[PDB]
Design a protein around this nucleic acid. Structure first.
Lengths: 205, 67, 141, 63, 143, 45, 65, 100
RNA sequence: GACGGAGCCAGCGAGUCUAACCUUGGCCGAGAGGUCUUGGUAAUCUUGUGAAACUCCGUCGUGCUGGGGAUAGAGCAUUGUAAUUAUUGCUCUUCAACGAGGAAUUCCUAGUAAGCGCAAGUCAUCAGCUUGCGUUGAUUACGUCCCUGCCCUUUGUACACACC
RNA sequence: UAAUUGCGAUAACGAACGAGACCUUAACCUACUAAAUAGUGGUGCUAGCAUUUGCUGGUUAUCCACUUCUUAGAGGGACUA
RNA sequence: GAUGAUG
């Protein structure tokens, strides 16, 4: 039975006393994505509450792998300058977007994020190689960590460009971007760009 | 970098050739001896001098060291 | 005298002085219930110490905090750390050791900031720029 | 087309004119005891699992 | 148990009290409410031309409660804002003295506030009764 | 005379330009640097 | 370093000649061993007390009182 | 007779010799006092360009002077205050005394 | 995101002799500002410097539009002997360029970049400047000698004003 | 190695300036010496809401005690142990 | 083992 205190503490919050859920709603106990090359670089094994941690992840090379992927998605929305900082908006925008996803699909909203990321990381990329000034591209592979880093970039960049001069609010454009990407649908801006990079990478082998 | 300078290498060297019996393999004790054995002008330098001496006692334990 | 204890926590310029004494579970921040903390979104940060251990541990104690300095975000980090430290200092003085160790294990395993302050502090600005490491634009023609 | 997976078992030092590439030795998860030398674009360590689009290529080097 | 004003969110309390004063109709409205704008920093007059004044009175009544004494100056600071200034950047600009003065004069007449030594106003005995009765009403309406 | 640049002058070289008035020193910037050690203004950080 | 403000005294003067002015700058480094107030030597000097010779024992003995 | 003894200087070591002399002098007479209340140090600043003519890379310099005010409260007869005001003259320290 | 009401939090500093300085509080005015008092030669007063971004609730609804406020007209005030070639501040009217920017090019590796303002210098008056201060706080390397340059050795030289 | 920083090699041996040391400033101390011109608690007087010994407040001419938060003086601490 | 005159 819920504890009674001099200062009342609602029962809905007291339910979390036996398990931690993000934003008090979404759970972490069933989220796993099959791409075996990224299980060590998507952090969904430590539940958190508010997607606002203030962690010190910049001091060492690979520490950013242990940051929960929900906050690393949150962190990428504070861009295009005017919105640098202003992290609270990011915590709220992720809240609306997740609620929307579970309305539109009836699947765990976090699972959508992990699926979309694992379907967007480009496997093959290219670099400039030459000598004296003449430059031609070369085919190379792409590391696990970088597939996540570039995956999130494409997702938030696509959502942000849509929200510009468009009636749909930011929370939605990211919601439809995430739904499509996990669906492996060419309508998504993220998947369009994954295929374009891979196609150029194959022509330059 | 963690490369000591000659004012530390030589000061520790002088201590071992004159006070081997009293030094130990422990920083804290060696910290207090250097106060009773040598006149040093700072807490920072005194820590460094004693730290190297501990390091040299460890070397001498495994076998003699040139110099 | 009534059993009591004092602790505090910090982040940037925020400081929260938490006073604890045996009681009936009162928990209050700046004279208002914990429930009314603002900004709203970060409220579960203030709740975090209570959940990670269990509300049972708080039924026999009264906690009153008062926070000053800093900004709207750093304060919430001061508050949660004052609550975490206060509870472990109360078990330090009036309850056995085995309980103190277990409680510190729950907090440490989750978020070190609940017990140990953040070491980061700002760097001074330097002349020739707008900030610590930024510099004014340079021109050659 | 299919994809094949291998596992990094050593890092052989940076490559590329500007240093943006890394040379790696991989170890196929299936039919192990086959190892190829190839290049990577971002940060890479030991034990990382890579997704090679094609298998039979081996990478040039500065030496 | 009992109740104090500090036990209810600021937004909930201010909305509840502004409605109450509007209904009773015993608070003086200075008459030029429909013309002026609450601070020089603003560029348009308040939207709720009906009940913006009773809303300001609801806030200031609580603000005295929390603190010991205040004044026209403290309230110019409290409700001040960021001027635009167009091409040139922003700067803090104090609020309108006339409004924040005639709200303080009005409050005493209805009996919520009294002057105090050291200068500035002070919550009176009557004011505490008025603000706490309503407080219990807002909490009771949590349904 | 009651105000302005010309109402003031460095107490050492009567220069109108650069005068520093904080703490009522009333010495020009070039003269402050020379005399700082004697006035008691040292350079630390 | 700090020793400059501890152990150095300086002076700069002008001299008038028919060719034109010329300057003289003097610097004197006081010996730190003679310092009446302040540090007695440079920050980086270390000296050690010479141990006293000790001879071993013959056989344990006790002294009564 | 109640007194306040405010001390000030720009060099702590001297300020400490005079102040510590005050407490030891009074405590051998077993007077009642409030120990030396050390007020926050106040630091002055003057930031100016190094160049005297206005050419070269823009470089600035900062200076500082420090003040170390103290004050001590005493309760003693008149015959002893007369000499308390006359003891402890030390260059670099300014002393002021307020009665009642 | 603009606008209108509420929420409501810093630190570094400064302040009256051959003298008027920082200014609370009451009253008057829409505003600017006026007026009678008061505290401070300062961990005491101004000063919790109740600062801005921020959060909450509403008005607006992809429209050169309630984005932007340049350019002009009309009145009301402050500082100064004296402002017209409007010092600045307030009020209503006017409501242009600008729809994310060609070749080029600058700064930056964490409480850092970037966003937001406050004190000081200048000052009778006027920050779009500078020196500091805090507040909110990411992405991306943990490498290389391709470009631009630095340090050490070897080697060639008809250079010495020294590869201009 | 950040370093003409060291290990060493060795027709050179032993020295001097530079770097480091040094000084300022920022981060810790429930340890020392204190402090209404800083704070906290208790008691007097006291408003408001409940009332079982409660919650939030006011009172600078009411007093007492104390030093976690605040100021410093003097120290401790990191040396890659 | 692209191009790279001049004062």
């Amino acid at each position: 039975t819920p504890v009674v205190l001099a200062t009342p503490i609602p029962e809905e919050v007291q339910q979390a006393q036996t398990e931690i859920k993000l934003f008090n709603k979404w759970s972490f106990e069933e989220v796993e994505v099959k791409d075996a090359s990224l299980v060590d670089y998507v952090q969904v094994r430590q539940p958190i509450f508010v997607a606002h941690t203030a962690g010190r992840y910049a001091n060492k090379r690979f520490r950013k792998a242990q940051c929960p992927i929900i906050e690393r998605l949150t962190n990428s929305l504070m861009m295009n300058g005017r919105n640098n900082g202003k992290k609270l908006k990011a915590v709220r925008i992720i809240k609306h977007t997740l609620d929307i996803i579970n309305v539109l699909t009836d699947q765990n909203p976090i699972q959508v994020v992990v699926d979309a990321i694992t379907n967007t990381g480009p496997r093959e990329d290219t670099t400039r190689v030459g000598g004296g000034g003449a430059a031609r591209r070369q085919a190379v592979d792409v590391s696990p960590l970088r597939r996540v880093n570039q995956a999130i970039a494409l997702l938030t960049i696509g959502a942000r460009e849509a929200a510009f001069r468009n009636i749909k609010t930011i929370a939605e454009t990211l919601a439809e971007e995430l739904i499509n990407a996990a669906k492996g649908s060419s309508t998504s801006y993220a998947i369009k760009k994954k295929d374009e990079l891979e196609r150029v990478a194959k022509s330059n082998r | 970098g963690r490369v000591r300078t000659k004012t530390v290498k030589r000061a520790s060297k002088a201590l071992i050739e004159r006070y081997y019996p009293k030094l130990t393999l422990d920083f804290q004790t060696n910290k207090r001896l250097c106060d009773e054995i040598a006149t040093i002008q700072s807490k920072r330098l005194r820590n460094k001098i004693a730290g190297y001496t501990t390091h040299l006692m460890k070397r001498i334990q495994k076998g003699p060291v040139r110099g | 005298a009534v059993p009591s204890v004092q602790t505090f926590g910090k982040k940037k310029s925020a400081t929260a002085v938490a006073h604890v004494k045996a009681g009936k579970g009162l928990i209050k921040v700046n004279g208002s219930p914990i429930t009314l903390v603002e900004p709203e979104i970060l409220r579960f940060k203030v709740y975090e110490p209570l959940l990670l251990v269990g509300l049972d541990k708080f039924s026999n104690i009264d906690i009153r905090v008062r926070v000053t300095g800093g900004g709207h975000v750093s304060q919430v980090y001061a508050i949660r750390q004052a609550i975490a430290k206060g509870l472990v200092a109360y078990h330090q003085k009036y309850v056995d050791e085995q309980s103190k160790n277990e409680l510190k294990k729950a907090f440490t395993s989750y978020d070190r900031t609940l017990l140990i302050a953040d070491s980061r502090r700002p760097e001074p600005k330097k002349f020739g720029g707008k900030g610590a490491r930024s510099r004014f634009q340079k021109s050659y023609r | 087309t299919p994809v094949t997976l291998a596992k990094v078992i050593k890092v052989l030092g940076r490559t590329g004119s500007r240093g943006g590439v890394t040379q790696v030795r991989v170890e196929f998860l299936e039919d192990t005891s086959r190892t190829i030398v190839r290049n990577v674009k971002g940060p890479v360590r030991e034990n990382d699992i890579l997704v090679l689009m094609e298998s039979e290529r081996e990478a040039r080097r500065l030496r | 148990p009992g109740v104090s004003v500090r036990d209810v969110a600021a937004q909930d309390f201010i909305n509840a009290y502004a409605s109450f004063l509007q209904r009773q109709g015993k608070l003086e409205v200075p008459g030029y409410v429909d013309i002026v704008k609450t601070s020089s920093g603003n560029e348009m007059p308040p939207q709720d031309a009906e009940g913006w004044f009773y809303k300001r009175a609801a806030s200031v009544a609580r603000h005295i409660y929390m603190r010991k004494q205040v004044g026209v100056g403290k309230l110019n600071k409290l409700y001040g804002g960021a001027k635009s200034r167009g091409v040139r950047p922003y700067k803090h600009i104090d609020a309108s003295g006339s409004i924040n003065r005639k709200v303080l004069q009005a409050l005493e007449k209805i009996g919520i506030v009294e002057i105090s030594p050291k200068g500035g106003r002070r919550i009176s005995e009557n004011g505490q009764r008025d603000l706490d009765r309503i407080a219990a009403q807002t909490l009771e309406e949590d349904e | 005379r009651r105000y302005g640049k010309g109402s003031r002058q460095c107490r050492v070289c009567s220069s109108h330009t650069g005068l520093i008035r904080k703490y009522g020193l009333n010495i020009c910037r070039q003269c402050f640097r020379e005399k700082a050690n004697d006035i008691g203004f040292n350079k630390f950080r | 370093g700090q020793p400059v403000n501890d152990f150095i005294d300086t002076a700069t003067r002008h001299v008038l000649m028919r060719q034109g002015v010329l300057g003289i700058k003097v610097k004197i480094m006081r010996d730190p061993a003679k310092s009446r107030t302040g540090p007695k030597a440079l920050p980086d000097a270390v000296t050690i007390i010479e141990p006293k010779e000790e001879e071993p024992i013959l056989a344990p003995s006790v002294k009564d009182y | 007779i109640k007194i306040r003894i405010t001390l000030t200087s720009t060099k702590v070591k001297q300020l400490e010799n005079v102040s510590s002399n005050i407490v030891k002098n009074a405590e051998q007479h077993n007077l009642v006092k409030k120990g030396p209340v050390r007020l926050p140090t106040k630091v002055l600043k003057i930031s100016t360009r190094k160049t005297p003519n206005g050419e070269g890379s823009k470089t600035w310099e900062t200076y500082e002077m420090r003040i170390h005010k103290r004050y001590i409260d005493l309760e003693a007869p008149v015959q002893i205050v007369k000499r308390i005001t006359q003891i402890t003259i030390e260059p670099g320290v300014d002393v002021e005394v307020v009665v009642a």
